Amino acid sequence: AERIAFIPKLVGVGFFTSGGNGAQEAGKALGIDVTYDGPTEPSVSGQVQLVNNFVNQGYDAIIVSAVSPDGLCPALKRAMQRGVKILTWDSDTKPECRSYYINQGTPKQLGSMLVEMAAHQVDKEKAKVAFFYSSPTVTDQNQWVKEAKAKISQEHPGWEIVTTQFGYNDATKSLQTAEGIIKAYPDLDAIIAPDANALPAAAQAAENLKRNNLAIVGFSTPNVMRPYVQRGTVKEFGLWDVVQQGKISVYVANALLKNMPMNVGDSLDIPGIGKVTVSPNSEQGYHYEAKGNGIVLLPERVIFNKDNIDKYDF
Numbered sequence: 001a002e003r004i005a006f007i008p009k010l011v012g013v014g015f016f017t018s019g020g021n022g023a024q025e026a027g028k029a030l031g032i033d034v035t036y037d038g039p040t041e042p043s044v045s046g047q048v049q050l051v052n053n054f055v056n057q058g059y060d061a062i063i064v065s066a067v068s069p070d071g072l073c074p075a076l077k078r079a080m081q082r083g084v085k086i087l088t089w090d091s092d093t094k095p096e097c098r099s100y101y102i103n104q105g106t107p108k109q110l111g112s113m114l115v116e117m118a119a120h121q122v123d124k125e126k127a128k129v130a131f132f133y134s135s136p137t138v139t140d141q142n143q144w145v146k147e148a149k150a151k152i153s154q155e156h157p158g159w160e161i162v163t164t165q166f167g168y169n170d171a172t173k174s175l176q177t178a179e180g181i182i183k184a185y186p187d188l189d190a191i192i193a194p195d196a197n198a199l200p201a202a203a204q205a206a207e208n209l210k211r212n213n214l215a216i217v218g219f220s221t222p223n224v225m226r227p228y229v230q231r232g233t234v235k236e237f238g239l240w241d242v243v244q245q246g247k248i249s250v251y252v253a254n255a256l257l258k259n260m261p262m263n264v265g266d267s268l269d270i271p272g273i274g275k276v277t278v279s280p281n282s283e284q285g286y287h288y289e290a291k292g293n294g295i296v297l298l299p300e301r302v303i304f305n306k307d308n309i310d311k312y313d314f
């Protein structure tokens with residue numbers, strides 16, 4: 001009877017497939033029919049069309065990873081006015097446009113990981129670094145990058161951010177851009193790619209142009225990144241239990257459907273996971289707080305290498 005919609009940025013990417021599977025698995029254990037559906041490409045119109053669709057069908061809850069902070073707001077607010085529980089995972093909208101943000105960590109946390117991974121691989125205070133992710137308008141990544149760039153200028157002033165280009169979650173376009181940066185910048189020391197499509201594309205671009213001495217860190221799935229790690233192209237990268245993330249999003253949504261207290265400070269017990277807690281929106285850097293509105297932070301983030309890459313199954 002209760003239907004929950006789980007919308008990714010796009011389909012075909014291993015990151016969203018894992019999260020969607022963990023969501024449907026969670027819904028099945030709760031007796032909830034979770035419908036996993038997303039556009040073939042990350043666009044505003046793509047998700048809005050779907051959001052409006054699940055609303056008209058009368059879905060009870062919709063969990064969405066936004067491709068734009070304010071792009072989905074008119075459709076999300078329409079849903080809540082009809083009683084549709086709106087939650088966000090991975091990528092957030094505006095805090096007033098949703099209810100809960102199932103976040104994998106604060107921008108300071110994930111922004112620290114990107115810099116720490118880079119500093120450990122470059123091992124010199126004077127170098128040239130380049131950023132390379134999906135889109136300049138996406139929410140989650142731009143929040144990380146801004147905190148990352150701020151952290152770099154404070155902790156590594158000798159580092160020169162020479163460029164910042166995009167791939168738009170396209171495996172083809174990401175490869176072209178990655179090669180272009182590598183060609184145009186022969187003095188490049190490191191590439192920071194906080195994107196599941198950008199990170200393996202950068203590693204591939206390094207191997208295609210046979211460029212060594214190049215630190216390549218970022219955020220992607222161990223499934224895709226595995227060949228590049230074994231060959232030594234990527235010594236270190238990071239992510240999180242995305243399967244668990246999709247699992248939490250459903251459980252939290254279920255707590256809203258069953259009228260449980262989920263204000264800032266309250267907790268919730270999840271089987272096989274433990275204790276999650278509603279953190280304030282200030283953790284993301286937001287100036288917005290409300291009753292029944294907060295951020296659920298993931299318990300643990302993971303650093304991947306050649307030692308523990310076969311440990312996680314998504």
Ligand SMILES: C[C@@]1(O)OC[C@H](O)C1(O)O
Nearest residue numbers: 015090140194195196219
């Ligand atoms: C994990 C991730 O960085 O890869 C795809 C998205 O950009 C993402 O979810 O933020």
